Amino acid sequence: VGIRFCQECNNMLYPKEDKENRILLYACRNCDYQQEADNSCIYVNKITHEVDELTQIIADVSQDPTLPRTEDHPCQKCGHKEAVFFQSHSARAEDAMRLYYVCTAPHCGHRWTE
């Protein structure tokens, strides 16, 4: 899944297979350096698009004045009543209109979806 970078020349490594070893080895055209592939995964594709919007949003977003704030919904981690509510506004967010809440307390870094 992650890119592999050549230690010797800092260039991308392309996996190659040798029958005797039976282990995937990353190969560099520029240099002879080779290393085993623990992942052994050549390619990965996800059509799920299930990435959480909470990871995409950040704690600093709550500080914005324009965003509306609800005292009714408290922050679970620090028990702070004030919290900010906004739509996801992200790719593939048409299916879900779920509200996203970020704690307005500074440095709390707590984000939850309601």
Binding site: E8, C9, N30, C31
Partner: protein, 134 residues
């Protein structure tokens, strides 16, 4: 500790003129090159450019063994003057203005020659992908 307890005050002297120009040599942290390991270092103006405008070229253990090319800075004192402070036997600090800044970068390990032929070969590989319908 003892260093914190000790307080040292040293006079600073700036020479109006310096006989030898002071320049900065920079080595990449990732390269981790060691001055002690090098058998010798030779510094000359870059052959490809062939004065001060030409970048310094550093060869370590011969040009083939290692190549470093200095990167000239268009303005070194233009944003602010830079002064080199040197420890002295009296201990009074001496400040020297930096005439030029050079950053030395290691040459790519693979090296070799590309030229027009390499560009054509890469185009041919792209054409081979284009030729196949699938």
């Amino acid at each position: 500790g003892p260093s914190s307890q000790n307080v040292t005050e040293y006079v600073v002297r700036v020479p109006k003129n310096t006989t030898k120009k002071y320049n900065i040599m920079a080595f990449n942290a990732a390269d981790k090159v060691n001055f002690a390991t090098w058998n010798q270092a030779r510094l000359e103006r870059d052959l490809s450019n062939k004065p001060e405008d030409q970048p310094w070229l550093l060869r370590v253990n011969g040009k083939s063994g290692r190549k470093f090319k200095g990167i000239k800075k268009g303005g070194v004192t233009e944003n602010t003057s830079y002064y080199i402070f040197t420890q002295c036997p009296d201990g009074a600090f001496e400040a020297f203005p930096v005439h030029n800044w050079y950053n030395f970068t290691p040459l790519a390990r693979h090296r070799t020659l590309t030229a027009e032929e390499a560009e054509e070969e890469w185009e041919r590989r792209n054409k081979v992908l284009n030729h196949f319908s699938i």
